Amino acid sequence: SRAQILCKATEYIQYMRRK
Amino acid sequence: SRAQILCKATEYIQYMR
Amino acid sequence: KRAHHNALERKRRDHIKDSFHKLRDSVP
Amino acid sequence: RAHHNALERKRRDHIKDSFHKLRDSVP
DNA sequence: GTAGCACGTGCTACTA
DNA sequence: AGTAGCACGTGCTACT
Ligand SMILES: NC(=O)CN1C(=O)CCC1=O
Ligand SMILES: NC(=O)CN1C(=O)CCC1=O
Questions:
Q1: Is B11 in the pocket of ligand 2 (CB under 6 A)?
Q2: In this structure, is the CB of residue D21 within 7 Å of any atom belonging to strand E?
Q3: DSSP A1-19
Q4: Which residues does chain B have within 8 Å of residue C24's beta carbon, measured at their own beta carbons?
Q5: How many domains in chain C?
Q6: Domain that holds residue C8
Q7: How far, in Å, CA of C18 to CA of D10, rounded?
Q8: CB-based contact D14 B3, cutoff 8 Å
Q9: Angle CA(B9)–CA(C14)–CA(A8) in degrees, nearest 5?
């Protein structure tokens, strides 16, 4: 789902950018 | 952009991982 | 009737375009 | 027109392709 | 009865 | 001037 894909990458970028 | 954003994101993720 | 659907899809595109802008803001 | 339409069909497809490449990158 | 999708257009914007 | 890029309208399946 396009909404789900955007949310994922966005939530994984945010997490992984704070390590 | 939209396409710019997906490439940038895909490529940013590819490098951090 | 259907304009209700066209207006509702306008909110969905706005939602996707919102998520595009959010994802872009998280990547340098 | 058909030519215009034909390019956008192909441009959309490249956007979807770019959407599936991003879902496959993140765990 | 709404959500996700992809399509056919028309408009602005960028490319040789 | 052609090709990108975007948003709309709109007619689909499919889910919850
Ligand atoms: N913008 C955000 O980060 C919050 N959010 C959404 O809107 C969908 C998934 C998610 O985590
Ligand atoms: N599979 C890939 O080449 C990765 N990629 C591209 O080619 C453009 C930027 C992007 O996301």
A1: yes
A2: no
A3: -HHHHHHHHHHHHHHHHT-
A4: 5, 8-9
A5: 1
A6: 1-28
A7: 24
A8: yes
A9: 35
